[PDB]
Write a protein that binds this ligand. Structure first.
Ligand SMILES: OCc1ccc(NC[C@@]2(Cc3cccc(C(F)(F)F)c3)CCN(Cc3c[nH]c4ccccc34)C2)cc1N(O)O
Ligand SMILES: Nc1ncnc2c1ncn2[C@@H]1O[C@H](COP(=O)(O)O)[C@@H](OP(=O)(O)O)[C@H]1O
Length: 241
């Protein structure tokens, strides 16, 4: 069952955290990679779960628990905006918030997750997405999960100023909302020490804190997917996946 709730937004180090939690607990962690490289069936389940935000709350909470059964932690979209509900469902779970410089975050988001509608790189991302078998339902899940995390009904995804404001507002509100001894804010570069002390575990012996999922590596993955049109053919070059 869930031991750690991760509230950090995509492109803040969530895959490195997922890897780190799996090293610490020796059990699997949710992350969107789980959805795309393992379980594309859960897309609609998240999308429908998102529209839901008393017998309404019990129905939502049971569907969250079923989606997360078998995992010890959640990172990344679409679980982000549910961090408060997860605190209620799992009262002993600790909460992590991965953060970084807002401009670095926005660039990383634009290059990997949510390119502008007139960015030429969007064309490549979409071509690689088809090689992975991702359809418009996945795109709507990404957009709706971000809107849900930001608590916005209407969001112009092409507006960087609004995304930067939403980023700062989201990170501030997590730090206001999570009881303070229940929260650890992790900045990129912090390493094992703050995470292991917060979780009260020993630092893993002789291994660096994970450094995975860079935009440089995602750009290479997209380029290789577009070139050969086969994930099986290229997976050997991307051992993290
Ligand atoms: O939770 C991490 C996360 C969750 C979901 C997604 N979906 C983003 C993508 C789809 C998309 C959505 C909206 C607009 C567009 C656009 F604009 F291109 F049309 C594309 C763009 C790239 N595609 C492959 C992929 C990259 N990473 C992934 C992680 C997991 C699963 C797949 C991917 C998915 C990305 C990430 N990140 O952070 O990578
Ligand atoms: N240990 C680490 N040190 C520095 N940056 C790290 C890191 N682990 C992950 N990152 C950065 O976190 C981002 C990935 O976050 P996520 O896994 O949530 O999608 C990437 O930013 P860049 O796109 O700027 O390279 C990646 O380089």
């Amino acid at each position: 069952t869930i031991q750690v709730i991760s509230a950090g937004l995509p492109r803040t180090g969530t895959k490195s955290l997922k890897n780190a939690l799996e090293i610490i607990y020796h059990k699997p962690c949710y992350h969107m990679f789980e959805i795309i490289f393992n379980k594309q069936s859960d897309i609609i389940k998240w999308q429908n779960l998102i529209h839901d935000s008393t017998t309404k709350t019990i129905a939502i909470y049971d569907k969250l628990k079923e989606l997360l059964d078998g995992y010890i932690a959640t990172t990344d979209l679409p679980t982000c905006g549910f961090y408060k509900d997860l605190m209620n469902i799992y009262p002993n779970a600790k909460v992590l918030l991965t953060i970084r410089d807002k401009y670095d975050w926005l660039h990383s988001l634009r290059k990997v997750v949510l390119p502008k509608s007139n960015d030429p790189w969007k064309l490549k991302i979409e071509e690689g997405d088809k090689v992975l078998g991702l359809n418009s339902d996945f795109y709507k899940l990404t957009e709706d999960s971000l809107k849900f995390a930001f608590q916005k009904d209407d969001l112009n995804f092409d507006d960087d100023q609004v995304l930067l404001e939403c980023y700062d507002e989201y990170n501030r509100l997590v730090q206001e909302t999570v009881p303070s001894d229940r929260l650890l804010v992790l900045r990129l570069g912090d390493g094992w020490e703050p995470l292991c002390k917060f979780l009260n575990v020993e630092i893993p012996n002789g291994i660096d804190y994970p450094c995975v999922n860079s935009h440089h590596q995602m750009t290479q993955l997209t380029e290789q997917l577009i070139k050969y049109k086969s994930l099986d053919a290229i997976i050997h070059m991307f051992p993290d996946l």
